[PDB]
């Protein structure tokens, strides 16, 4: 039945589902706004809200933790020094997800927008 179960598999096994969320994080933090399909988006929020929040912590530990998923040192600086501060007085909700009215043509997919909040 799979009742009161949290989190989507999206038609891919675990390690690929990881790599997905990581590769969406690196991309989102990089461009500040991104277009994915709606469900991949709704599921990216939590993944980076946590990635950001740990940058708001600032400690070396908290960095190294973010470095596990995002993996690139330069991005982490941009996360820690540039991005993180803008949210310092924001408790939660560092990402917006907005649905686009255009259906991707040729697979039919509903699209959305994912941007860092401000």
């Amino acid at each position: 039945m799979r009742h009161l179960k949290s989190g989507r598999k999206l038609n891919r096994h675990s390690s690929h589902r990881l790599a997905l969320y990581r590769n969406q994080a690196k991309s989102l933090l990089t461009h500040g706004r991104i277009t994915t399909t709606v469900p991949k988006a709704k599921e990216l929020r939590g993944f980076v809200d946590h990635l950001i929040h740990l940058a708001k912590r600032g400690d070396l530990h908290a960095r190294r933790l973010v470095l596990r998923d995002l993996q690139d040192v330069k991005l982490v600086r941009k996360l820690f020094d540039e991005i993180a501060p803008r949210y310092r007085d924001r408790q939660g909700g560092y990402t917006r997800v907005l649905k686009l009215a255009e259906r991707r043509r040729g697979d039919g997919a509903p699209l959305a927008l994912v941007e860092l909040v401000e």
Partner: protein, 59 residues
């Protein structure tokens, strides 16, 4: 398993009644808050989507 096969060609009556649910629904649309055009709701418009956040710029 053997090979189930249809026993009788189905009447034009019958397939056409099968299809009695097949008809489409028109897309549900609402007038754009700013722009003139129609947009399906809860979606950033193809022209100048929203206010507080930063819409995809057609502006």
């Amino acid at each position: 398993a053997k090979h189930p096969v249809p026993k009788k060609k189905t009447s034009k009556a019958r397939r056409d009644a099968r299809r009695s649910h097949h008809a489409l629904t028109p897309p549900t649309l609402v007038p754009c808050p700013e722009c003139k055009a129609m947009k399906p709701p809860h979606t950033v418009c193809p022209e100048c989507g929203y206010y507080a956040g930063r819409k995809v710029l057609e502006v």
